[PDB]
Amino acid sequence: DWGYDDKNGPEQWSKLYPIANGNNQSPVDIKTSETKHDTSLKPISVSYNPATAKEIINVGHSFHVNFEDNDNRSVLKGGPFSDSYRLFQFHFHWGSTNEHGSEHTVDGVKYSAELHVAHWNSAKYSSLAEAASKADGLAVIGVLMKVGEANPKLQKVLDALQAIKTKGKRAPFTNFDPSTLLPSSLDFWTYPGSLTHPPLYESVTWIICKESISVSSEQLAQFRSLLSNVEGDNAVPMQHNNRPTQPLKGRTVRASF
Ligand SMILES: Cc1ccc(CNC(=O)Nc2cc(S(N)(=O)=O)ccc2O)cc1
Ligand SMILES: [Zn+2]
Incomplete structure (x- = not known):
């Protein structure tokens, strides 16, 4: 099936997932001179309950931290949304070396990693499974991670690996x-886009933070030292899991700032 290597990677995904060549694919390069400031954009409001944190899982190409999503204890509101979106997961993308690893880029600049905080539209839909294929079904906050000082907020996550x-x-x-x-600032860009790996549904409203967060070279090494193989097999480090940026195809990236 699909992955990030030469034979099964992003350039091959269109063979089983033709939507890969779609008009609302993610990630994208955000060109700041081509963004349109939108005055109707409200501030982002996040209210998460730490009791909803559930489980961390190695999924082969990445790892996921999942949240209980049976009620509205943990929600995203504001920005471009009228609906409340329920938190379900966060995860990261990273690259082979510090030089690359983010999925989104800003004026052609690649960051070292990217944090995705994913939510589903519980105002309109009854489950993640229902929401996942709907144009207004998912909301994902993307945060660009710039290599620099060690980030202490990552500690519980890294310690769990x-x-x-x-x-x-x-x-x-x-x-x-x-x-x-x-x-600390939640100034953002937003655009209509997609999941960044199969099944690549064009169901995501992206919220990309203007401000980066830090990550050290050694914290990134911790991600890359996760193994994609099952226990007992030859060790295969998870070296990278970022998709190349995709054509805007006439979409507008809006700015809250
Ligand atoms: C069958 C079924 C597939 C998908 C989903 C919804 N999606 C996720 O639960 N996670 C996810 C997130 C991203 S991303 N990197 O854009 O945040 C890419 C691919 C994904 O599958 C639900 C049900
Ligand atoms: Zn992601």
Whole structure:
């Protein structure tokens, strides 16, 4: 099936997922001279309950931190939305070296990693599964991670990785509020786009923070030292999991600032 290597990677995805060549694909390069300031954009409001943190899982190409999503204890509001969106997961993307690793780029500049905080439209839909294929179904906050000082807010996450080293391993991950990972300013860009890996549904309203957060070279190494193989097999480090930027195809990136 799909991955990030030469044979199964982003350039091959269109063979089973033709939507890969769609008109609302993500990530994109944000050109700041081509952005349109939108006065109707409200501030982003996040209110997450640390009791909704559930589990951390090695999914082979990445790792996920999942949240209980049965009620509105943890929600995203404001920005371009009238609907309340329910938190379900966060995860990261990174690259082979510090030079690249973000999915979104800003004026052609690649960052070292990217944090995704993902939510589903619980005002309109009854489940993640229902919401996932709907144009207004998902909302994902993207935060660009710039290599520099060690980020202490990443500590619980990084400390958890030793228990989920190989594909399929999972462990409880509780009492964590991922708004602690967000930058202090929530000034943002927004555009209509997609999941950045299969099944690549054009169901995401992207909220990309203007301000980066930090990550050290050694914290990035921790991500890359996760293994994509199952326990007992030859070790295959998770070297990278970022998709190349995709054509805007006439979409407008709006700015809240
Ligand atoms: C069958 C079924 C596929 C998908 C989804 C919704 N999606 C996710 O639960 N996660 C996800 C996030 C991204 S991303 N990197 O854009 O945040 C890319 C691909 C994904 O599958 C629900 C059900
Ligand atoms: Zn992602």
